[PDB]
Paper text:
However, when the C318A mutant was oxidized by H2O2 to become a C318A/C315CSD mutant the transaminase activity was almost abolished, and this loss was irreversible, representing overoxidation of the redox sensor to sulfinic/sulfonic acid. In this study, we determined the crystal structure of the oxidized C318A mutant (C318A/C315CSD). The overall structure resembles the canonical hBCATm homodimer and contains a Schiff base-linked PLP in the active sites, which are located at the interface between the small and large domains of each monomer. The overall structure of the C318A/C315CSD variant overlays very well with that of the C318A mutant and the oxidized form of wild-type hBCATm, with a few exceptions in the interdomain loop (residues 171–181) and the N-terminal loop (residues 15–32). The interdomain loop, which was not interpretable in the structure of the C318A mutant owing to a lack of electron density, is interpreted in one of the monomers of the C318A/C315CSD structure, which overlays very well with the interdomain loop of the oxidized form of wild-type hBCAT. On the other hand, the N-terminal loop was not interpreted in either monomer of the C318A/C315CSD mutant, while the N-terminal loop was interpreted in only one of the monomers of the oxidized form of wild-type hBCATm and was interpreted in both monomers of the C318A mutant. In the structure, C318A and C315CSD follow the β-turn (residues 311–314) adjacent to the active site. Conformationally, they resemble the CXXC center of oxidized wild-type hBCATm, with the oxidized C315CSD having a similar orientation to the disulfide bridge in the oxidized wild type. For the CXXC center, it has previously been indicated that the dipole formed by Cys315 and Gly312 contributes to stabilizing the phosphate of the PLP ligand and the carboxylate of the incoming substrate.
Human branched-chain aminotransferase (hBCAT) is an enzyme that catalyzes the transamination of the branched-chain amino acids leucine, valine and isoleucine and α-ketoglutarate to their respective α-keto acids and glutamate. The hBCAT proteins are PLP-dependent enzymes and their reaction is accompanied by the interconversion of the cofactor pyridoxal 5′-phosphate (PLP) and pyridoxamine 5′-phosphate (PMP). It forms a homodimer, and the monomer of hBCAT is composed of a small domain (residues 1–170) and a large domain (residues 182–365) connected by an interdomain loop that contains 11 amino acids. The hBCAT CXXC center, which is unique among aminotransferases, lies adjacent to the active site and can be modified via oxidation, including S-glutathionylation or S-nitrosylation.
Numbering used by the authors:
A (entry chain A): 3 to 23, 29 to 171, 178 to 365
B (entry chain B): 3 to 22, 28 to 365
Amino acid sequence: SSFKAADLQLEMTQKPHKKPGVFGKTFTDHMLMVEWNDKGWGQPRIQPFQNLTLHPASSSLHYSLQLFEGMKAFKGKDQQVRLFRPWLNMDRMLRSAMRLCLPSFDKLELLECIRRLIEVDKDWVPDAAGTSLYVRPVLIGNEPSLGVSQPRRALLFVILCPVGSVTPVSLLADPAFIRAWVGGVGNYKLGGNYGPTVLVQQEALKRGCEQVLWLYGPDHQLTEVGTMNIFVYWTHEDGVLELVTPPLNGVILPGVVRQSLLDMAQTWGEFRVVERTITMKQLLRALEEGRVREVFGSGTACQVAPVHRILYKDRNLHIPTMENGPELILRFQKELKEIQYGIRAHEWMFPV
Amino acid sequence: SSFKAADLQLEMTQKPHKKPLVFGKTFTDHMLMVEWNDKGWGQPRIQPFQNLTLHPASSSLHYSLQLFEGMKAFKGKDQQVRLFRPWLNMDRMLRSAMRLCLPSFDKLELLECIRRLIEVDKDWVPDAAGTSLYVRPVLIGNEPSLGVSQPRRALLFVILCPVGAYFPGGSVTPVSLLADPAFIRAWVGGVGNYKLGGNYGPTVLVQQEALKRGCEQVLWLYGPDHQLTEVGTMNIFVYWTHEDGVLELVTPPLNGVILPGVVRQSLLDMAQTWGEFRVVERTITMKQLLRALEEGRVREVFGSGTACQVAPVHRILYKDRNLHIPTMENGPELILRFQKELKEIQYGIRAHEWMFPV
Ligand SMILES: *Cc1c(COP(=O)(O)O)cnc(C)c1O
Ligand SMILES: *Cc1c(COP(=O)(O)O)cnc(C)c1O
């Protein structure tokens, strides 16, 4: 059925790594690990940070039967650690698992195991300004077989990273490259979605841009920004101030922060908050008519990323985000910072 | 620059096992292994069949920085092993590597390493009817980092499997296909035309959705006009009399959604050398097929891959309606011919430039 938090074994480290005096390069001393097979879910293990022992014909390495998740744990002023809406990360992880025919589990049980893991490495969580602990739960197929079938053996593991912007980012809008397709798997956080992006990412760095803007369809629809969802604060063609983000139709990943920004903006009710398709045509005109206020990306890595420049077909489009405050961005960050670092009590935060 | 066959180290096993079977579950005693890092390509290693030791943040397991290849080694009557057009598998592997920002290597050097590996496990190659050794070269990223970037560290390894007749007795069973346009394998400007693991993971759910609707494999439709692209892990062919009223063999052209199959190319080359009928690479729609079936113009529909050289198709389930494909009633002449000549070429009965001796 599922692994239990009650059966959790604790093997403490006898070779603890040095704490720092760089995103996802420094790792903590401990990692969660649960195996699945014909018999079912084994006992969950909090083991020291070891290497993985995989069969050369492991489905994870051959047919990309792999999925992951990204959520942050914030140590507040009272020095109590809290996870930001971890339930939505657990929801999206199970939806990913069912898509790749990997074993289903109890969401609340895995959360408790991740809670206990962070409890053990409690000292690894930084309490510095704009710093957190990045949680990386992973589920992979591990059947020793080259058959493209439902894996008989799987492996769920979690690893932690201490992590450390006021600066805006430049985007490359090249329609030649397609991240995901309607009826694809773009709306699941599967490794398969990322491998292809690495070439497109370095093609952006070599054209001056920092991150990629992913266009889809002949009408060149704005979908995502690298590993972030996209928002546009602007006065629409109807002449009404709205916040718009592409809707969940298969190409867009349902971001936890994306959903949090919509929920937060809806509760204000001060301006219109819609999920509608955004085309380059709409933006080029909106920029021409000076209707665009702020463009930004939302992810775990970057909570609210200001966008100042977009390179599209050898022409630089200046986005006037920073000239317009950026009001909405600074507001979102402020309230998120208050919620996350415990300054303001909220139902979203899950205490360790 | 690249690893060399001259620097190849040989660590022999000391526990050779089995030699009895099901596809890609039984493995040989030895495996090739070359590591890449900042310094560059290390010495290539023929080691015993061990497990892999990967960092928990290995790019291969997180961001699917992984690609593979599939080619067969055929032990002839003279008991000499030969690889079927291995150069094209090496070409497609390098094109895959460049797409995922993985290190480029010398194609001829890796082939020589794979040749030496099969030379060591020469006894593992079966000489039974319709049996071969399946070769599985793999290249993965192995940088201990959660950054979505070009991997600083990689790992190239090759493993071997003895495999059985896809069709026992020489006689061939046909397959049922599910044509559901709701599911999309690849997209134009995607990575469908590269043999990357990322392309396959999503197919497993669509494959079991076919099994539970009676069908055996999936037919992948693309676009609003419902273009026939691929069959599961095989390219698709249609032997028929076209609307112009001429007998032709047609397969979807290489435009990003189609993987350039070694066998696909081999069937085109072989049919072109005959010059007995028209051989074209043109888009095939369901409309064209539904009409061609209605007018009884369809002779044979089949899939081509390494696993299945020539797969007969007898049934296609499309919009909750079963389309009968008259492949088996028409011989199948072209299929049986293709298999016969391929079998003669591969098992050494007929000498050909395509075969590479071990
Ligand atoms: C991880 C990721 C995001 C961010 O997800 P959040 O839950 O909002 O942190 C956005 N887009 C893509 C493509 C991603 O992979
Ligand atoms: C692996 C694969 C094939 C087989 O390619 P060959 O080189 O002909 O063996 C065909 N189509 C798809 C989609 C594949 O993934």
